[PDB]
Design a protein around this ligand. Sequence first.
Ligand SMILES: CC(C)Oc1cncc(-c2ccc3cnc(C(=O)NCC4CCOCC4)n3c2)c1
Length: 344
Amino acid sequence: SKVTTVVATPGQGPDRPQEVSYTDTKVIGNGSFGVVYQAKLCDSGELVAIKKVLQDKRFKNRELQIMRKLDHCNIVRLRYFFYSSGEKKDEVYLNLVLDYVPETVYRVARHYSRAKQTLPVIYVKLYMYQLFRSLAYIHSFGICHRDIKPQNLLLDPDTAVLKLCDFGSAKQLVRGEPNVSYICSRYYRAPELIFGATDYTSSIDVWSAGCVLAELLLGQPIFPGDSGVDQLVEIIKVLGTPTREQIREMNPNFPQIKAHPWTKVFRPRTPPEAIALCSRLLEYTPTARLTPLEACAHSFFDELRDPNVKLPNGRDTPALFNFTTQELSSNPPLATILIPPHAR
Ligand SMILES: CC(C)Oc1cncc(-c2ccc3cnc(C(=O)NCC4CCOCC4)n3c2)c1
């Protein structure tokens, strides 16, 4: 019954520290960033995640400032943050107390591939829709995630709620200010980033999302490259060689191969609207890619807007159409498609 009590500021609302008590601490994740724990809150009994990262006193933490201003059903809420000691001697650690979610897209996708099965397309629709909705929301603040990958996409297996969680690579993209090119997980990295682009946009997340979509359809990563130029070689094998104009659009500042047909890339009987969506995300030209809100309105997701749609377990789908004023503001016309007649 070992209770840890800390003094923590709530993620939203006034800067008034309060006592937060928790127990049953266990490791659920780690990385170069640091460590993620699971814990149980003493009062409520609810499970939480505690992300612990190393922190400097003078410089302000970017992830924290990003996470505090996000409030969305497809993003893990920052419940509280607090400072502590850890593995090092004279070092302060930032702790982010977040919503807990019991599964990941990676784990579900791997569990299916271990059984030689493709994930049922209803789950592909549900998870990809919720990813794009979360991206639209964060992109409305000018925030780019910069690390969309199956490992970071959290899942409740019973409700099929998807949640974004890792904002350790995230950044407000200002037009004119340069950004690092070596970002995102390699297999999900936009080709402009491989070309060394420093003036890139939020469309890198859409490319990454497209790689996740393709992976869910294929049962394995679409572009499993080695480091350096070889990741671009993996992309070229499907997309064909990029033209001089496509390179200029990617990085304004060669091995010539024909594009493999999108139908031949995917399995027999992969839904044409899945393939169609994928071809409009995995585009060389970053401006040619769908926006996240355009992606949500794509016909691949029409089954989600059917009033008789259910999860495989027989439950109702999660909240997909409760779009706020803030969500709709980036492209208000799409509200017609996105909020279907029965949800109005
Ligand atoms: C590469 C991953 C570890 O990078 C990250 C980086 N930053 C934050 C996070 C993060 C945040 C909040 C949060 C809540 N649930 C989970 C979770 O992973 N649940 C999945 C389960 C998987 C099975 O074992 C129990 C945990 N969470 C992760 C992850």
